[PDB]
């Protein structure tokens, strides 16, 4: 299927594709043509993916001198695994269309937790454990011990890869993580290191956003060689929050206690070294005096001489001084305060620790830790985090704040004080991506208005287009319920949120909807407290019994294992005749991780506008900074994030394969003129006055009709 | 249970001519008849059948000198 795209005729595998795909491709092409970044939105995942790959591949085949490589990033590995299979399918078509093989290579990267084959780490399942052992297995001392040929458990796959795998680069093809592991097993080469090396001889690379946002991993993959390469985000609607979160760090009482235990372990190691030999380790002292990896970005990090910290004793003393000050500053009993400059100024005043040596805390730590021949970093991790935090806060804080909380999060009060170095802007943190790469494309679904993004992120969008699904039938049906059958407003106002009538209206609505919606249905709540309160209220009433009697019900919690089992049971219940109902919190990890498909979340219910507790210090610092620095109003951004998060959790009902789904919003707020404008265009245009202010009964009636209309073939 | 025997009582009231022949075939000895057979509350019970704890608890703590509604109360209280 040759597509008459604006720039060139593009070969495509499927004989038929929808009109919006042509627009999306020819629109995205503008970013290539204009040699600049842009933003756009498209509901379908697979369609926009395959069309993106086709467009960029054809463009790359047409202009290989202009674009050397394509960098694609997506939400998670399970999605990446499907995308890379779609690329293979596209390449298989292209090879069949061309009739011959071409020098093209594409691969997906992943952490050593998944992308590993060594027998000793294979029984390990925690990422830090696998990484710590892998690092130890690949460590220079283990390599040296291996070169000594003494009895040693070593990574034969690494030695054979360094010897042979490095000597011969893989010629061409597409290698999925499972296929890359099998390849590594067959070749006897480390899949992770082989993939990392293959980046040097590959045209397409796939990894998640944190492989691009965290500078340690991102720098190794975003080298200057990619000075004229294109990077594309496919579902980074929360790129700001992920970026800020990747920059933010949390310190706690137990963290400091672990750091102290680690510090005592370092001291014991220094003693063991001093009693054995320190002169050999002083070989590092020369390069240090001459002048895991730090999270500091390319332009922020420098190989400057570490300063007064010139010995292990100095570093350990300097670390002791800081740890004591941090513990002291953390254990202080007072209201939550923000000291962005004052913490550093306080550190200089209270313990006379200057930012200059402190800037090299992580640099010296890794150097010292390496020379110390430590077993593994897994246990030292809290101390490394403290050292990373220390260098980070001492280097720059323009886009950060220090928050001190007498108690742990998620709890009203606990005798475990915590400190946060909360980040507040994505622009400066993501700046290297836009500065180095020639084009950046922000693609996503459930994407709230685009013009807010150029404010939160520093970019000059070449494209500003919002696409809507084009089909012979309205496969998606958004609807907003604003009134309960009890002739009462169903709005989730903060004071009205706890109203028994609204709670009852949601229960009656869910009872009826769960009875009429086939297979799997899902409902999102604002928070566990309201959810439990709501469930408890429904349990005191007959509502919860009638619901469970009509269909099985499952509820999500903070526990990943319990929610995973419950979700698997929910899905298995949907496979069988029993069917199931899934209740979850919109902000819950399950909502950002789960993908909804036909009969698996066929209908998604949103109870109220998802507004986070506005008294939370994190929100306060973030929101005031956006107003002070980026000039965005408090209610503007707070509503934008609520609209975005609602659409994100609710819009996931449509993912691909042209399967129908229902999206009901139980709040008249969504029907307001501003909220409607903040709603994504595809939802906004399918939404209409007939379904904009439906009564609970009207919602059930329109849903039942829509289900009847969707059951027949196209 | 003596279902083999009970089936006679079950069919004694379900169909009289069927049972009358079953008897006359033996009373008048028309054929060897033993060959015949070779050819031819919900609250507690639903909970007991559904939950392992009640399943085991009811087996050991089966109602004796008490009212079943008391056992129901002991569960939901």
């Amino acid at each position: 299927m040759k597509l008459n795209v604006d720039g060139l005729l593009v070969y495509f595998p499927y004989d038929y594709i929808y009109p919006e795909q042509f627009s999306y491709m020819r629109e995205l092409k503008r970013t290539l043509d204009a040699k600049g970044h842009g933003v756009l939105e498209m509901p379908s995942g697979t369609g926009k993916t395959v069309s993106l790959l086709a467009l960029i591949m054809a463009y790359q085949r047409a202009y290989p001198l202009e674009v050397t490589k394509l960098i694609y990033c997506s939400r998670t590995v399970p999605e990446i695994e499907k995308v890379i299979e779609e690329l293979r399918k596209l390449l298989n078509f292209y090879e069949k269309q061309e009739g011959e093989k071409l020098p093209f290579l594409g691969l997906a990267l992943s952490s050593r937790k998944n992308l590993c084959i060594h027998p000793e780490v294979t029984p390990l399942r925690f990422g830090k454990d696998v990484d710590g052992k892998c690092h130890s297995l690949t460590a220079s001392y283990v390599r040296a011990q291996y070169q000594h040929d003494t009895s040693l458990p070593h990574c034969r796959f690494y030695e054979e890869f360094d010897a042979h795998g490095r000597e011969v680069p893989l010629p061409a093809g597409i290698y999925n993580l499972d296929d890359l592991k099998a390849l590594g097993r067959r070749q006897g080469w480390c899949p992770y290191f082989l993939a990392r090396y293959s980046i040097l001889h590959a045209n397409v690379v796939v990894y998640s956003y944190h492989y691009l946002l965290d500078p340690k991993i991102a720098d190794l993959v975003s080298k200057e060689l990619a000075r004229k390469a294109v990077v594309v985000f496919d579902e980074a609607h929360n790129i700001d929050n992920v970026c800020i979160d990747s920059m933010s760090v949390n310190l706690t009482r137990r963290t400091l206690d672990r750091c102290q235990g680690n510090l005592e372990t370092l001291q014991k190691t220094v003693l063991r070294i001093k009693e054995t030999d320190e002169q050999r380790l002083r070989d590092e002292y020369r390069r240090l005096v001459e002048g895991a990896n730090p999270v500091l970005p390319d332009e922020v990090l420098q190989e400057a001489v570490p300063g007064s910290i010139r010995t292990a004793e100095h570093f350990l003393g300097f670390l002791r001084r800081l740890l004591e000050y941090v513990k002291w500053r953390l254990r202080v009993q007072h209201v939550v305060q923000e000291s962005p400059p004052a913490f550093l100024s306080g550190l200089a005043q209270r313990v006379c620790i200057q930012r200059k040596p402190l800037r090299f805390c992580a640099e010296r730590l890794r150097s010292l830790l390496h020379t110390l021949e430590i077993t593994d970093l897994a246990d030292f991790s809290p101390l490394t985090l403290l050292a990373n935090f220390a260098t980070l806060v001492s280097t720059y804080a323009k886009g950060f704040t220090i928050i001190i909380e007498p108690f742990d999060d998620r709890t009203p009060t606990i005798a475990n004080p915590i400190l946060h170095f909360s980040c507040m802007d994505a622009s400066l943190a993501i700046k290297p991506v836009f500065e180095r790469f020639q084009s950046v494309i922000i693609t996503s679904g459930t994407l709230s208005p685009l013009d807010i993004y150029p404010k939160i992120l520093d970019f000059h969008p070449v494209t500003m287009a919002t696409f809507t699904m084009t089909l012979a039938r309205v496969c998606l049906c958004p609807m907003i319920i604003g009134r309960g059958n009890d002739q009462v407003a169903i709005s989730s106002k903060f004071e009205t949120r706890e109203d028994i009538a609204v709670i009852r209206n949601y229960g009656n609505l869910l009872l009826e909807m769960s009875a009429v919606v086939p297979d799997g249905i899902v409902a999102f709540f604002t928070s566990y407290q309201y959810m439990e309160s709501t469930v408890a209220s429904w349990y005191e009433q007959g509502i919860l019994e009638n619901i469970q009697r009509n269909k099985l019900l499952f509820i999500e919690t903070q526990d990943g294992a319990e929610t995973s089992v419950a979700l698997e049971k929910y899905q298995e219940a949907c496979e069988n005749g029993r069917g199931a109902i899934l209740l979850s919190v919109a902000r819950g990890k399950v909502s950002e991780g789960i993908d909804f498909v036909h009969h698996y979340g066929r209908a998604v219910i949103m109870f109220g506008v998802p507004y986070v507790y506005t008294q939370s210090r994190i929100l306060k610092a973030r929101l005031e900074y956006l107003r002070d620095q980026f000039q965005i109003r408090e209610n503007d951004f707070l509503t934008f994030d609520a609209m975005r998060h609602a659409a994100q959790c609710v819009g996931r009902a449509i993912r691909g394969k042209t399967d129908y789904g229902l999206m009901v919003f139980a709040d008249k707020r969504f029907a307001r003129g501003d909220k409607r404008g903040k709603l994504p265009r595809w939802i906004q245009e399918h939404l209409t006055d007939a379904n904009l202010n439906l009564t609970v009964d009207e919602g059930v009636q329109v849903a039942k009709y829509f289900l009847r209309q969707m059951a027949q073939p196209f | 249970a003596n279902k083999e025997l009970e089936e006679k009582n079950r069919m004694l009231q379900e169909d009289p001519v069927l049972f009358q022949l079953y008897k006359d075939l033996v009373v008048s000895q028309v054929i060897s008849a033993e060959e015949f057979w070779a050819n031819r509350s919900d609250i507690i019970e639903s909970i007991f059948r559904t939950y392992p704890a009640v399943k085991m608890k009811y087996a050991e703590n089966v109602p004796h000198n008490m009212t079943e509604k008391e056992f129901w109360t002991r569960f939901f209280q």
């Binding site: 439990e532 469930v535 408890a536 349990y539 919860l544 469970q548 099985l552 019900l553 499952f554 509820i555 919690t557 089992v565 419950a566 049971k569 298995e572 219940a573 069988n576 029993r578 199931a580 | 001519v17 069927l18 009358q20 022949l21 006359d24 075939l25 008048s28 000895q29 028309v30 054929i31 060897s32 060959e35 050819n39 059948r49 559904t50 939950y51 392992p52």
Partner: protein, 185 residues
């Protein structure tokens, strides 16, 4: 409070765990379908065609020349109950219940006797049910004439031999099958 959610989800989990136990149309000779069971001078056609054309010279004749009371009465009398064209009992009552008793008995007995009678089945257990069925046929043949004698002596009129014919025919099938089996053996 969380126990309610935990219990409700345990319940749904236990309910689920309890619900998990450990060719185009083808033809070669279609004309034969047109007939079904239906089974199977040239000048006379021309003569009949010409003669009928001259017979069609007279039309719309007089009803009183077309028909007559003699012809009409002959038809009505023929259609009368005593005529050539007009073609035109629960006397015993206690026998009614006896017949039902016998019909139910014979019906029950014959289902078993025929259960494996028409199939050849040259196997030990399948052949033994044949023999066991025949022995049972020899057993019913003892008691059935005794009931017949009662009917015959009590009625001595309006005999009911139909019931007996099912038995006699089963014996004809018995002797034919037995002789055929011995012949095939």
């Amino acid at each position: 409070n969380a126990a309610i959610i935990k219990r409700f989800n345990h319940h749904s989990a236990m309910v689920l765990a309890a619900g998990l136990r450990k060719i185009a149309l083808n033809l070669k000779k279609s004309d034969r379908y047109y007939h079904g069971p239906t089974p199977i001078t040239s000048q006379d056609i021309i003569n009949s065609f010409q003669s009928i054309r001259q017979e069609m010279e007279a039309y719309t004749p007089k009803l009183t020349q077309v028909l007559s009371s003699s012809a009409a009465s002959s038809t009505i009398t023929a259609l009368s109950p005593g005529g050539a064209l007009m073609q035109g009992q629960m006397v015993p009552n206690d026998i009614q219940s006896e017949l039902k008793h016998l019909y139910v008995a014979v019906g029950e007995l014959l289902r078993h006797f025929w259960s494996c009678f028409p199939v050849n089945t040259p196997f030990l257990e399948e052949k033994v049910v044949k023999m066991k069925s025949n022995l049972e046929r020899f057993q019913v043949t003892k008691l059935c004439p005794f009931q017949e004698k009662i009917r015959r002596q009590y009625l001595s009129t309006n005999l009911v031999s139909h019931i007996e014919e099912m038995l006699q025919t089963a014996y004809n099938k018995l002797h034919t099958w037995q002789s055929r089996r011995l012949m095939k053996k």
